[PDB]
């Protein structure tokens, strides 16, 4: 049943907890991982499960879909998106101190109600 790319358990067993959890298979390379291990959340988990998810490196800056200066390519926290700090609507200069949120996150933030 595959294994996650961080503890290498499976879609029904974590190696770091010993708890059942469905892995996420990258759509760019095909490697599996526990969203929890992926540092994700449930929204991210679901997101990857509903669309073409990428495992960090496979994660290209959707904004310009290049992933050039990836060393800036921020990491989303609700879906699994990736945006170059210098591509964002309000381009980042330095990795936000708190929990950064991609645009999908924001549009989802509003879409939550109304």
């Amino acid at each position: 049943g595959s294994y996650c790319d961080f503890c290498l358990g499976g879609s029904n067993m974590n190696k770091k907890s010993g708890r059942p959890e469905e892995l996420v298979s990258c759509a760019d390379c095909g490697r599996s991982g526990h969203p929890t291990c992926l540092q994700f959340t449930l929204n991210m988990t679901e997101a990857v499960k509903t669309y073409k998810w990428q495992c960090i490196e496979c994660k290209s800056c959707i904004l310009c879909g290049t992933s050039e200066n990836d060393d800036q390519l921020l990491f989303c926290d609700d879906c699994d998106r990736g945006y170059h700090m210098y591509c964002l609507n309000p381009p980042v200069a330095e990795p936000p101190e708190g929990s950064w949120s991609c645009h999908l996150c924001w549009e989802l933030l509003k879409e939550k109600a109304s």
């Binding site: 790319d5 490697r31 540092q39 960090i56 994660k59 060393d71 990491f75 990736g82 990795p95 929990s99």
Partner: peptide, 20 residues
């Protein structure tokens, strides 16, 4: 703000090299 660089990218792990 997990950025895609050395200092971070802890979600870029893909099974440790142990299976030869």
């Amino acid at each position: 703000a997990r950025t895609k660089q050395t200092a971070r990218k802890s979600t870029g792990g893909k099974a440790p090299r142990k299976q030869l």
